[model samples]
Target: CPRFLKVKNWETEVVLTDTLHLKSTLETGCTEYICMGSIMHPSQHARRPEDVATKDQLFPLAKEFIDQYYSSIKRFGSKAHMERLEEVNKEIDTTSTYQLKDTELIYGAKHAWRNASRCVGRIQWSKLQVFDARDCTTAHGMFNYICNHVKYATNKGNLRSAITIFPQRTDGKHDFRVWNSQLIRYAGYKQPDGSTLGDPANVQFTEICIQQGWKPPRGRFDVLPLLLQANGNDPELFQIPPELVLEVPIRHPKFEWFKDLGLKWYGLPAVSNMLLEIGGLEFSACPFSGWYMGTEIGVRDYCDNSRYNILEEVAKKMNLDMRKTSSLWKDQALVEINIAVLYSFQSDKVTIVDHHSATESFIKHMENEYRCRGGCPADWVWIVPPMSGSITPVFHQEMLNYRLTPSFEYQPDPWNTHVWK
Candidate 1:
């Protein structure tokens, strides 16, 4: 007979498994801080709520998180779980905010990445390096953490997956916010003439940098400065040490003339703008880095007509006429560029994946997630590669995207988050 284990804290007993009381802990080899895996996340809730919850309403929320934490460890009915829950609830009732242990933060960070439905790289969810900067007191401290993260993630061009988490949000306002879309990106400068130089995607941010006392060097591929905000103060721009930034020059495997284009990209693809939410706590300045997939650079960034739009130039080199669609200039250019990105990264010894293998790996990870959790959250549009839409396996697979707890959410731009006189 399956026994129902009830807690003294008014929470009803749940039928967990054939064995309880830590007798049948499932084999994930994890005995440390655990995120609740059994409970269904609040998939319908927005990333951030407009209204504040009453202090009374917060205790249960925090308490529920503790329950999930303990449940993940297979200790929901254990004494340690109950004691931790009582302490969390008490802290919430008294101060209206609670702190997370280092163990919890580490596990929660990985859980957030695992729940990132838009990412095709979730197969590496269990592997992540998390740096806790909760003790950071000032903007300078945040800068140091970011530098360390950049250095570690860059790893001399062989990139590694890592994230540095600053303090959590309070009063619906983030104390720390990274103003750059990415920790490293080329600046976009609108030239004096009716033309644009550098990456067109970053012109507005470059404008903000200019307004904030940045003197653009007028280089087409100049790396942008970091704008760090702390304690709601105005963002301060910090230039990353040039040695720490590793760039891979694009070169084709067969086309020797491809070197003439002088195209390159930063080795580290670190996103600094997204908010990392964990167990109802929001880390507003968690900068994360991981390896790039080849199509992201070759197909989406390079070949996109709106962005770099280097297709015509590349096709011209291949002696293909761009004006006629019957000649299939676009297709030839796309395949060539895609091959170049993969070859460039591989030659430079940087971590990168091709779209074909990435999708195959995703299919395996999807099955694992479904078998373990009954379902996996995914956005079909995001999961499918930008090119080779029908050929990729993920395109045929139906995906349902639902917001899960401990997930990454895009916060507003720092400039839009506040008004400046």
Candidate 2:
């Protein structure tokens, strides 16, 4: 029977290459923000240049957040704590170029330039640090968490710390049940209007979970819930993203012009006395600052530069009409790029490239072709060369002999490994 199928979350797929890069980086220690396409869906991923553009657009927002966060700390004066904040702020503002100066995190010891030489740029680590609110926020959240423990330890005559309730509204309306797993709740507390409170009473701001003495999750002053609660229900409702608030403090202080612009603010204690314990991290480092921002750089960009001339030459030499053709692999003589599959390939292979040069070369070839084609994937199944893994009877040969067919006779279920059989 002929079939009609619709796909969901194409947008997510479009960003998968970037997202996979992000996921792998988080596995490492770098902490930085990544564009959406780096993680969510890579099969439908777009051009790296476009991903750069999207990240460029996102930077101003993140930068603005960072600036505001720094400015908020300024009010306290440049004491020892403020000095640390300044150090962190400098770290936050460091460019991708600056990050590249260090050994590229995910890719082997090679720098971004060396990695990019072979389209192996996919192996570079992401710079984003994905801690909950504590690390991202100025000392406010950390100070609160420390203080809460100090208060508990002092009052109890011991240093044992446990999860505590966040001081949200206990006014009997909103159900505090959601926090039950994360927090320890208290008994009936009535509001001034005599209504039974529904929120957690003993929500001690944040909790630290350390089992059999594994190091507790990296401590950070949590901010997501505070930001969400202070603003309305929508996480994106605030005019600025959190990164921006942390980036530009003076212009967007908590009670400053941002609130006038309809932004919300609860004093530092109310807003800062929250924390989240997260176990993972992610980061991404790019070359150009504004290229990702979507602006013309020197009248041309890495995408438009002559490095990609090979693509045009190949297309012309092979009579391939990528715009009109449904698939490039259909004709062995022709070649085209698909951002989606390439992104997925990048994600899946991020870890492997760190150890092998051949694998890195293979990744570079695929990514180069993908970038050169400007993010469009030909409707074909690409047979990737097998590396040193399990050598099955089907692929026992040293050299890879494969084909790029215009779609497969049978659709492989993404979730099912048995389909490969």
Candidate 2 local lDDT, 203-308, one digit each (tens): 2222211111223222111222211121111111111123211110111212132212221111111111222101100121010100011111111111232311
Task: Write model 1 residue lDDT over 1-421, tens digit each, in one string.
Answer: 1243221111222111111222221122222486323233312345335445555655665665667677888888799877877777777677666778887888788878987778898999889999999988678888899999999998887788999999887765546888999999998888798677888888999999988998899786899999998766778889999998888899998999998888998888899999887656778899999989899889877877667778998999998987779999999989999999899999989999999899878877766776576455666668889999778777666654545556687677878876543
lDDT of 2: 0.23
lDDT of 1: 0.77
Q: Model 1 Cα displacement at 112 (Å)? A: 1.0
Any runs in candidate 1 off by more than 4 Å, and if so which? Answer: 1-44
TM-score winner among the candidates?
1
Q: Where is model 1 poorest over a 10-residue stretch in terms of lDDT?
A: 9-18
Task: In angstroms, give how far residue 339 of model 2 lies from its true place.
Answer: 10
Q: Estimate each model's TM-score.
A: 0.86, 0.17
lDDT, residue 338, model 1 = 90
